[PDB]
């Protein structure tokens, strides 16, 4: 098995356009995700609210859809509750709240894209492990 | 003085590494067991037997490398290189776990070799063979754990695998499945090992702290001569000290040292008996009275019932990956779990 | 080569430094050189930390133990403990590193070039261990030095920027201490508190006024004591109580340091005042409490009445009573109700956690802080995999509180062992049987049998 | 003593180091190449990182038949295309 | 309970004092060789 | 001599069948209190709410235990690290429900055993001995401290201290493995080297001295009668024992020096066990065993399990099952 261009091809938007990430992008994504996100989201779960995970199906049923690059980049700029009803930047790391979540300060657009790509690719690799929690360790 | 006697002459020469007749068995078997372990842990996988990486080549470290047991489907096959499974193919043989039986068997014969060495040298030097006799405990342990135990079970697969973390797993498996800590033979084993350690410590320290001043040095090691006739420490002072501290004390040195042989050797022998029981799943798993009371009375709780809950967790959560040949699929909803965790 | 083999010195190479006991010059060398080593590590380690320092990451995410010490002193940080200027860190490092060259210079000089004994060279610097007067004098000098140090802390706190105050109103911030606690009832009050739960002895000090006042007291006490020991000689009862020899003194100091090491272990494990959680990460209690807080907040947002929610055991799922009645967080964290922290205290009323405050007054910054601390609990592996022992690799984290506590427990333990060793030996040497029992005069042989 | 030359003598002799300053690096390099050329993989049948699974497979190639185990492994290896 | 507490406090203080004064009572000299250790 | 002087002379007397001494002055009452309370509790104490969730665990014989299952049960999690002496309870019944006996026993015992160590120093001093037997004893003592005091401090509750019972001990071990992966901790591994090695060297030394006993007896009597207490001559030939062992391995692997040898015998298990104690004492502050969970990964990113991951699954079983009603939130943070 290998990390192929096909594995690294993920939905860019809701309209069926894809984008193919480079291996450097994938590595940057893992690094940045560990840097700014893994403290709560290690393995694709959510420690401070385990009801919500980072599985692609879950993101797809989110509002607005979060199972593509644009959705995840937007979430990292202006995170909402699962129904899209509330903006939660005040209690969730984002560029909008980089003042109170300082690790968000040196994150570039390029970075957000890499993180997004990591979140989308990783379940293609790990399957049910991603968002599975300890049952699948 | 024919060829046999000439050979005996050469075998028993007083060289840097003594050979002896026993050396003919010992050195090749010990060399092959050590070499096999190093070869396996450096280069050889456990993908096809366990679904595990187990070598430096694959990225394992010292703690996680192992030469792993064969697949359960091999049963108790001797798994000889020229046998019907590998059929002479070295690579397939490695992939099927041939190195495990290779190491266990060359190792067993090597241990026989070493104990024979102890007899042979004792006989040549003119001492009593109590060192060999004491070495019977390592033998009993090796034979009960690596040979008898798996022979009682379904296959070589459930023998210990030769590796650090692999052995740790063996321990946890025995807790979860056999409740081995509950076993009075294991307990006697523990008493013998910890008691052995205690005697080692206390005897060494006592001798070192009842030394006669036999020199002017503040570093007192030089004030001893192997050829000297005199005891180098005071047994009388040692005896009074321990009599006044602990209530009782050795007064007889010969008894002291025999006892130092007796405690750990006996302990290991008892543990061996327990493992021979576990070969047949003949466990000290439960106390029946406990279970009858607890089944009828949902408020009755002891540390025994607590530990069984732990065991049940271990079994359910470790079996599917630890026993891949069983093809266990335990849906989430059936996994035993306490609140939240 | 005086006293540099076993034959002449009586000591083997592996106890070679025992050859230094009555060579005051060379021994001076060993000590000043060692001080050089200490200062060297301080400076070098600081520079290493600074080079590896990303200012917008929490210190405690970056394996830092010294920069937190500098920051606690008020240098380099602003509100909330945010790094506003790294240059003071740089200065502390550079200056320690430069000073270690001087110390090492003096140490090497005295150790292999200067007078091997100081007594013929100088009556001032020379000493005999058995000379109780001189010993108490040198002790006095060093007491005065220590007092001066404590006063340097006081001066930093009161006249040179102040200290980082995690309890500062409106949020943690650097604050000048203007009214230090001078009342001895309070100061020594700490000294007479139980070390057990909810009391915590001196480890419980929870405001900078008490810290500063304590160091004022300790400074005056040390200077006074130092003068005292310069001007006096041990009294008779003291003379009859102690062993008077180099190894004896070493043993006494080893006991002292063992004790201090244990105390420091507890300090860094429990205290979040002089070890601000902003810099050191949350304490164990703190992170456990923070988890309770976090899910109370989540579930209450979902519509739960957290005050009346009965858990599986019958105790409150979120809230319960302490054995004396205070309202506290439920679950296992019931053990940690003595915890106090700037993010939790606004929810605390006279009877403990206040249900009305919990329902109406919880701020976003509190949610944030509780989440941060819950997810940076001081748990992690030896290879720095953050989290519980069953966690998968992903987060590179072990709390500085864990590093400091474990390191100093190990050191305190071995220093207790060292105390037993050198005390027992000093006794035996002073009585004259450290080399073994005299065969022709074996004491037990002159004693009546036990039976 | 038992007739052999003291190790102290040998390892501090010039000739010893003339020999072994060649033979030790040679061996080290030989082992190095045993890995770097990939020969180790093939001698011992150890999977390279891309040979544990076929691309979409997620089932361990566990040996399940004692006497046709060899053929099973061979089949498993063919299954990596 | 208060009587119990007072009692234990008095007891513990008694023995602790025995310990301290005991070791203050010329203990270095209580050995089989060199007694002059003052 | 005055009464106090006489008293001191008796206390420190070298002629008492059991040495008292000043450490003994503290040791004797504390060990007696710990012992008595322990025996009474082990036989007759009612169930104790160890985990503070009103789920009382039965430890004593009269309440349904045998020798193997019985225990004096650690004090309640509700108490945490609070000092809970008898006079803090409203009644003996409350005291018993909350695990008071445990605290009384372990505190009196830790004090008493510390004084036991001191007493070993003291008698060594009175008898004209060298002083370091007590240093050897510091190893088991440190271990005792580790499991009865330090680990509770670190975890914030005496409810997590080792139980005073056999099965309770095993409980402590398994939960410890769940929460610290102690088996993968190098200090525990050094501890194992310490006690396995101690046992090895115990047997080895025993057998070597026994092998070289000088003939002094006939075949119809015990060889032990060939040694007489206080005889000045050594009772075995160490040159013969060394000839043997030196030939068993090679000559320079063996000790010809009895002092050196006995020092080794003291140092190996003592140091090993020192590291075991420090292992418990530092996992007390959650610096845990090596974690190589999912450390090996293939080219695609599939996890390739090692034996470490199997260990992890076992630990997971322990973790999710232990104290099954005590956790309300997803992380076990102490
Ligand atoms: C000469 C010496 C003679 C000694 C004779 C014996 C006398 C009694 C000795 C007591 C020994 C230990 C008792 C319990 C220690 C303990 O629970 O220690 C913990 C306490 C700290 O207590 C904690 O203190 C905390 C204070 O923090 C509070 O205040 C803070 C302010 O920032 C925070 O706000 C925090 O959140 C808040 O809770 C809380 O009160 C906690 O409830 C409380 O448990 O440490 C402390 O007081 C001080 C540290 C004590 C040292 C630790 C003992 C180590 C011994 C190891 C020996 C090994 C021997 C081997 C031999 C071989
Ligand atoms: C004395 C040292 C010694 C001992 C006791 C063993 C023992 C063993 N070896 Mg090891 N081995 C050794 C040295 C030794 N080996 C050496 C020096 C090498 C390097 C060449 C090896 C390399 C090696 C490999 C590669 C393997 C073994 C294996 C084994 C096991 C099976 C052997 C077997 O069935 O033989 C059967 C043969 C005999 C017992 C010979 C007896 C001969 C009789 C007494 C005389 C009559 C012979 C007769 C005239 C011959 C006629 C033949 C004719 C019909 C064609 C057994 C545990 C196998 C194993 O461990 O699999 C798990 C295995 O695969 N060994
Ligand atoms: C912090 C650790 C430390 C320190 C400060 C010392 C200091 C000392 N040791 Mg001890 N020792 C130590 C650890 C230490 N030791 C250890 C770990 C062991 C076991 C290996 C010993 C075993 C031992 C024995 C057996 C003896 C000593 C002796 C000594 C003294 C004389 C050394 C001498 O004359 O050698 C001469 C050495 C040289 C000429 C080589 C150069 C040495 C210098 C110091 C190197 C400096 C390097 C440094 C980077 C230079 C910076 C320069 C810059 C500032 C300009 C000296 C005071 C001796 C003694 O007590 O004599 C009375 C003695 O016999 N030591
Ligand atoms: C201020 C602290 C201090 C001081 C000044 C001394 C001073 C002395 N000690 Mg004491 N000792 C201490 C603390 C101290 N000790 C502690 C904490 C312990 C408990 C372990 C001891 C236990 C002890 C024993 C058992 C003995 C002494 C002895 C001595 C004397 C000779 C020391 C020597 O030359 O060793 C030379 C130094 C070495 C041989 C180095 C040892 C190597 C250590 C163990 C390495 C530690 C590992 C390291 C921290 C991490 C790994 C690094 C590695 C990877 C590079 C000297 C007076 C001897 C004596 O009795 O003299 C009268 C003696 O026998 N000490
Ligand atoms: C008070 C002591 C102390 C503490 C609490 C820390 C803590 C830390 N160090 Mg620092 N450091 C120290 C001393 C200390 N260090 C010393 C002496 C040096 C010079 C070697 C350094 C140089 C250093 C570097 C270069 C780095 C750190 C880093 C770190 C962080 C990661 C630690 C790690 O992964 O360890 C791994 C754990 C071990 C290696 C295990 C050590 C176990 C020892 C050997 C056992 C000793 C027992 C005893 C002393 C032996 C006595 C013998 C007996 C017989 C008596 C952590 C915050 C890292 C970091 O993140 O920086 C930002 C980093 O890169 N440290
Ligand atoms: C700290 C412990 C210490 C002690 C007790 C001594 C003691 C001694 N030294 Mg040594 N030395 C030391 C450290 C020490 N030195 C250091 C750090 C260095 C490197 C600079 C040296 C380099 C050195 C040399 C080259 C020589 C000595 C000499 C001497 C002897 C003559 C002292 C004298 O008459 O000065 C007179 C006193 C003064 C002139 C006043 C000093 C003013 C001080 C330095 C101001 C700073 C005070 C402040 C507290 C410093 C804090 C430092 C701290 C923060 C680390 C005396 C035995 C001489 C000797 O041995 O002759 C045979 C000699 O030639 N020393
Ligand atoms: C480095 C610190 C230090 C050291 C090593 C010494 C050493 C000494 N002092 Mg000095 N002293 C010091 C600082 C120091 N002093 C300071 C700062 C002051 C001013 C406060 C003094 C004021 C002072 C006076 C007035 C006297 C001494 C005396 C002495 C000598 C005998 C003391 C003794 O037996 O203590 C052992 C301690 C005791 C016997 C006290 C009773 C024992 C109880 C049970 C101790 C329990 C404490 C407990 C374990 C601690 C826990 C915390 C606690 C607060 C609850 C000894 C040389 C005596 C002397 O001979 O002077 C010439 C003396 O009369 N000192
Ligand atoms: C199996 C087999 C065989 C055999 C082979 C052999 C015999 C081999 C050998 C091999 C070998 C023989 C190898 C070796 C190796 C070694 C190594 C690999 C080592 C390493 C080391 C190290 C790593 C070290 C470490 C350490 C220690 C230990 C301590 C001190 C410190 C340190 C850390 C340094 C034959 C062919 C018959 C047949 C087939 C099968
Ligand atoms: C006595 C003795 C000893 C010891 C010794 C010692 C311990 C010494 C020490 C010494 C020392 C302790 C030294 C030090 C030094 C230091 C130095 C020399 C430094 C320098 C520095 C610099 C040059 C800096 C630079 C810089 C800057 C300025 C800026 C930033 C960056 C940098 C860092 C680059 C021994 C054991 C051997 C043995 C013999 C005897
Ligand atoms: C700074 C500070 C503070 C303060 C502190 C203080 C004020 C301290 C003091 C302290 C002290 C004030 C201490 C003391 C100590 C003492 C000791 C540690 C003792 C020892 C003793 C001994 C060791 C003795 C012994 C003996 C005996 C018992 C018998 C007879 C003999 C002899 C002498 C050997 C506070 C917390 C407020 C806050 C924070 C900051
Ligand atoms: C809370 C802890 C209490 C702290 C108290 C601190 C007190 C500091 C001053 C202590 C005074 C010591 O006073 C000490 O006691 C009595 C007084 O008759 C003496 O009494 C002793 O003398 C000799 C000394 O060889 C002994 O053999 C004899 O057994 C005993 O009579 C001690 O030799 C003396 O040194
Ligand atoms: C196996 C031992 C068999 C020994 S064989 C023995 O060897 C002698 C020469 O050494 C011969 O002279 C003799 O005839 C023969 O029986
Ligand atoms: Ca003076
Ligand atoms: Cl789900
Ligand atoms: Cl449990
Ligand atoms: Cl909980
Ligand atoms: Fe012996």
Q: Which bin fits the share of residues in helices of chain C? A: 40-55%
Beta-strand proportion of chain C: under 5%
| Largest sheet: number of strands, sense, barrel closure of chain D | none
Note the main sheet of chain C.
Answer: 2 strands, antiparallel
CATH class of chain D: Mainly Alpha
How much strand content do the residues of chain D show? under 5%
Portion of residues in helices of chain D?
Answer: 40-55%
Strand order in the sheet with the most strands of chain C: 1-2
Provide a count of the helices of chain C. Answer: 14
Counted beta strands of chain D: 0
Order of helices and strands of chain C: HHHHHEEHHHHHHEEEEHHEH
Amino- and carboxy-terminal Cα gap of chain D: 63 Å
What structural class should be given to the helix and strand makeup of chain C? mainly alpha
Number of domains of chain C: 2
Count of beta strands of chain C = 7
Bound molecules: digalactosyl diacyl glycerol (dgdg), chlorophyll A, beta-carotene, dodecyl-beta-D-maltoside, heptyl 1-thio-beta-D-glucopyranoside, calcium ion, chloride ion, fe (ii) ion
Taken from the alpha-carbon principal axes, the silhouette of chain D is elongated
CA radius of gyration of chain C is 27 Å
Which class of secondary structure composition applies to the elements of chain D?
mainly alpha
GO molecular function (chain D): electron transfer activity; heme binding; iron ion binding
Subcellular location (chain D): Cellular thylakoid membrane
GO biological process, one term (chain D): photosynthetic electron transport chain
Protein name (chain D): Cytochrome b559 subunit alpha
3D structure, described in words:
The structure is cut from a larger assembly and holds chains A (137 residues), B (341 residues), C (451 residues), D (81 residues), E (38 residues) and F (334 residues). Chain B is mainly α and 341 residues long. Chain B has helices at residues 3-11, 20-43, 47-50, 90-95, 98-125, 130-152, 164-178, 184-208, 235-246, 253-278, 288-296, 303-322, and strands at 66-67, 162-163. The longest helix of chain B is centred in the first third of the chain and has 28 residues, at 98-125. The radius of gyration of chain B is 26 Å and the shape is flat. With 451 residues, chain C is mainly alpha-helical. Helix content of chain C is 50%, strand content 4%. In chain C, β3 and β4 form a beta hairpin. Helices cover 61% and strands 0% of the residues of chain E. Chain E has one helix spanning 2-24. Chain E is rod-shaped. The termini of chain E are far apart. Chain F is mainly alpha-helical and 334 residues long. Chain F has one domain (1-334). Chain F contains 10 helices and 3 strands. The longest helix of chain F has 27 residues, at 100-126. Chain F is globular, with a radius of gyration of 25 Å. The N and C termini of chain F lie far apart (58 Å). Chains in contact: A-C, A-D, A-F, B-C, B-D, B-F, C-E, C-F, D-F, E-F. At the B-F interface, α5, α6, α7, α8 and α9 of B face α4, α5, α6, α7 and α8 of F. One chlorophyll A binds next to α5, α7 and α8 of chain C. Chain A: Belongs to the cytochrome c family. PsbV subfamily. Chain A: GO terms for molecular function: electron transfer activity; heme binding; iron ion binding. Chain A: Its cofactor is heme c. Chain A: One of its GO terms (cellular component) is photosystem II.
């Amino acid at each position: 098995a290998e990390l192929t261009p096909e594995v690294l091809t993920v939905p860019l938007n809701s309209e069926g356009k894809t984008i193919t990430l480079t291996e450097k992008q994938y590595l940057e994504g893992k690094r940045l995700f560990q840097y700014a996100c893994a403290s709560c989201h290690v393995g694709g779960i959510t420690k401070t609210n385990p009801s919500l995970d980072l599985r692609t199906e879950t993101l797809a049923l989110a509002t607005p859809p979060r199972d593509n690059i644009e959705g995840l980049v937007d979430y990292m700029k202006n995170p909402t509750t699962y129904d899209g009803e509330q903006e939660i930047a005040e209690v969730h790391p984002s560029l909008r709240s980089a003042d109170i979540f300082p690790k968000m300060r040196n994150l570039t657009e390029k970075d957000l894209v890499a993180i997004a790509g990591h979140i989308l690719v990783e379940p293609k690799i790990l399957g049910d492990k991603w968002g599975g929690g300890k049952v699948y360790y | 003085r024919g060829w046999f006697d000439i050979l005996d002459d050469w075998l028993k020469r007083d060289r840097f590494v003594f050979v002896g007749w026993s050396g003919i068995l010992l050195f090749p078997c010990a060399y092959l067991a050590l070499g096999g372990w190093l070869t396996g842990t450096t280069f050889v996988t456990s993908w096809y037997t366990h679904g595990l990486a187990s070598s430096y080549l694959e990225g394992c470290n010292f703690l996680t490398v192992a030469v792993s047991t064969p697949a359960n489907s091999m049963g108790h096959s001797l798994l000889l290189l020229w046998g019907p499974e590998a059929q002479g193919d070295f690579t397939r043989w490695c992939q099927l776990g041939g190195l495990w039986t290779f190491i266990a068997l060359h190792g067993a014969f090597g241990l026989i070799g070493f104990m024979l060495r102890q007899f042979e040298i004792a006989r040549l030097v003119g001492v009593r063979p109590y060192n060999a006799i004491a070495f019977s405990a390592p033998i009993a342990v090796f034979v009960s754990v690596f040979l008898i135990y798996p022979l009682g079970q379904s296959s070589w697969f459930f023998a210990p695998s030769f590796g650090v973390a692999a052995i740790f797993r063996f321990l946890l498996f025995f807790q979860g499945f056999h409740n081995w800590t509950l076993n009075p033979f294991h307990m006697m084993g523990v008493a013998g090992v910890l008691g052995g350690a205690l005697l080692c410590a206390i005897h060494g320290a006592t001798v070192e702290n009842t030394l006669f001043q036999d020199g002017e040095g503040a570093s007192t090691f030089r004030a001893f001569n192997p050829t000297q006739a005199e005891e180098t420490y005071s047994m009388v002072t040692a005896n009074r000290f321990w009599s006044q501290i602990f209530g009782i004390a050795f007064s007889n040195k010969r008894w002291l040292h025999f006892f130092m042989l007796f405690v750990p050797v006996t302990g290991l022998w008892m543990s061996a008996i327990g493992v021979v029981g576990l070969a047949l799943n003949l466990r000290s798993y439960d106390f029946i009275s406990q279970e009858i009371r607890a089944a009828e009375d949902p408020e009755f709780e002891t540390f025994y019932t607590k530990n069984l809950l732990l065991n049940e967790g271990i079994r359910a959560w470790m079996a599917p990956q630890d026993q891949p040949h069983e093809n266990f699929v335990f849906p989430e909803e059936v996994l035993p779990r306490g609140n939240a965790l | 080569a005086t006293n540099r083999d076993q034959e002449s010195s009586g000591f083997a190479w592996w106890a070679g430094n025992a050859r230094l006991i009555n060579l005051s010059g060379k021994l001076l060398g060993a000590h000043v050189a060692h001080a050089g080593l200490i200062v060297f590590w301080a400076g070098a380690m600081t520079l290493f930390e600074l080079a590896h320092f990303i200012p917008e990451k929490p210190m405690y995410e970056q394996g830092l133990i010294l920069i937190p010490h500098i920051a606690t002193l008020g240098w380099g940080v602003g509100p909330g403990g945010e790094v506003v200027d790294t240059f003071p860190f740089f200065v502390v490092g550079v200056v320690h590193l430069i000073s270690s060259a001087v110390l090492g210079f003096g140490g090497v000089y005295h150790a292999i070039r200067g007078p091997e004994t100081l007594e013929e060279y100088s009556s001032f610097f020379g000493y005999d261990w058995k000379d109780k007067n001189k010993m108490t004098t040198i002790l006095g000098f060093h007491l005065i030095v220590l007092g001066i140090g404590a006063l340097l802390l006081v001066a930093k706190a009161m006249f040179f920027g102040g200290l980082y105050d995690t309890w500062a109103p409106g949020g943690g911030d650097v604050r000048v201490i203007t009214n230090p606690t001078l009342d001895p009832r309070v100061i020594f009050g700490y000294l007479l508190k139980s070390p057990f739960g909810g009391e915590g002895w001196i480890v419980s000090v929870n405001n900078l006024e008490d810290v500063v006042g304590g160091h004022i007291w300790i400074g005056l006490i040390c200077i006074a004591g130092g003068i005292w020991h310069i001007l006096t000689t041990p009294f008779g009862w003291a003379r009859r109580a102690f062993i008077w020899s180099g190894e004896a003194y070493l043993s006494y100091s080893l006991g002292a340091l063992s004790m201090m090491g244990f105390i420091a272990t507890c300090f860094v494990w429990f205290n979040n005042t002089v070890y601000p959680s902003e810099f050191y990460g949350p304490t164990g209690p703190e992170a456990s409490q923070a988890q309770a807080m976090t899910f109370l907040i989540r579930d209450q947002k979902l519509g739960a009445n957290v005050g009346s929610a009965q858990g599986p055991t019958g105790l409150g799922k979120y809230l319960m009573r302490s054995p004396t009645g205070e309202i506290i967080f439920g679950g296992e964290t019931m053990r940690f109700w003595d915890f106090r922290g700037p993010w939790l205290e606004p929810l605390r009323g006279p009877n403990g956690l206040d249900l009305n405050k919990i329902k109406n007054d919880i701020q976003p910054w509190q949610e944030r802080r509780a989440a941060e601390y819950m997810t940076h609990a001081p748990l992690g592996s030896l290879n720095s995999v953050g989290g519980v022992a069953t966690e998968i690799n992903s987060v590179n984290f072990v709390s500085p509180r864990s590093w400091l506590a474990t390191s100093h427990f190990v050191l305190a333990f071995f220093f207790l062992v060292g105390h037993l060793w050198h005390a027992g030996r000093a006794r035996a040497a002073a009585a004259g049987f450290e080399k073994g029992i005299d065969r022709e005069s074996e004491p037990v042989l002159s004693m009546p049998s036990l039976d | 003593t038992t007739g052999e030359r003291p190790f102290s003598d040998i390892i501090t002799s010039v000739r010893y180091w003339v020999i072994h300053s060649i033979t030790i690096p040679a061996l080290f390099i030989a082992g190095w190449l045993f890995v770097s050329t990939g020969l180790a993989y093939d001698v011992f049948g150890t999977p390279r990182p891309d040979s544990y699974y076929a691309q979409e497979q997620r089932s361990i190639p566990l040996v399940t038949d004692r006497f046709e185990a060899k053929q099973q492994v061979e089949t498993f290896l063919e299954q990596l295309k | 309970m208060e009587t119990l507490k007072i009692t234990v406090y008095i007891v513990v203080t008694f023995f602790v004092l025995l310990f301290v004064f005991g070791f203050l009572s010329g203990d270095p000299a209580r050995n089989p060789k060199r007694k002059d250790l003052e | 001599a005055n009464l106090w002087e006489r008293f001191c002379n008796w206390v420190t007397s070298t002629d008492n069948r059991l040495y008292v001494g000043w450490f003994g002055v503290i040791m004797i009452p504390t060990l007696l209190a710990a012992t008595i309370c322990f025996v009474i509790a082990f036989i007759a104490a009612p169930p104790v709410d160890i985990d503070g969730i009103r789920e009382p665990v039965s430890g004593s014989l009269l309440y349904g235990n045998n020798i193997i299952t019985g225990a004096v049960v650690p004090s309640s999690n509700a108490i945490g690290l609070h000092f809970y002496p008898i006079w803090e309870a409203a009644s003996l019944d409350e005291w018993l429900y909350n695990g008071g006996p445990y605290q009384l026993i372990i505190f009196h015992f830790l004090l008493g055993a510390s004084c036991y160590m001191g007493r070993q120093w003291e008698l060594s001093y009175r008898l004209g001995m060298r002083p370091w037997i007590c240093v050897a004893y510091s190893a088991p003592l440190a271990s005792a401290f580790a499991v009865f005091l330090i680990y509770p401090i670190g975890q914030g509750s005496f409810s997590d201290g080792m139980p005073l019972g056999i099965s309770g001990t095993f409980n402590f071990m398994i939960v410890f493995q769940a929460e610290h992966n102690i088996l993968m901790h190098p200090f525990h591994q050094l501890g194992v080297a310490g006690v396995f090695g101690g046992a090895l060297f115990c047997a080895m030394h025993g057998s070597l001295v026994t092998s070289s006993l000088i003939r002094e007896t006939t075949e119809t009597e015990s060889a032990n009668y060939g040694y007489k207490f206080g005889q000045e001559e050594e009772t075995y030939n160490i040159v013969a024992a060394h000839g043997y062992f030196g030939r068993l391995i090679f000559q320079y692997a063996s000790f010809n020096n009895s002092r050196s040898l006995h020092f080794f015998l003291a140092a190996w298990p003592v140091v090993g066990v020192w590291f075991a104690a420090l292992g418990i004492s530092t996992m007390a502050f959650n610096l845990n065993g090596f974690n190589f969970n999912h450390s090996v990964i293939d080219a695609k990113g599939n996890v390739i399990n090692t034996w470490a991951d199997i260990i992890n699954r076992a630990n997971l079983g322990m973790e999710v099952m232990h104290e099954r009603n005590a956790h309300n939130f997803p992380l076990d943070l102490a």
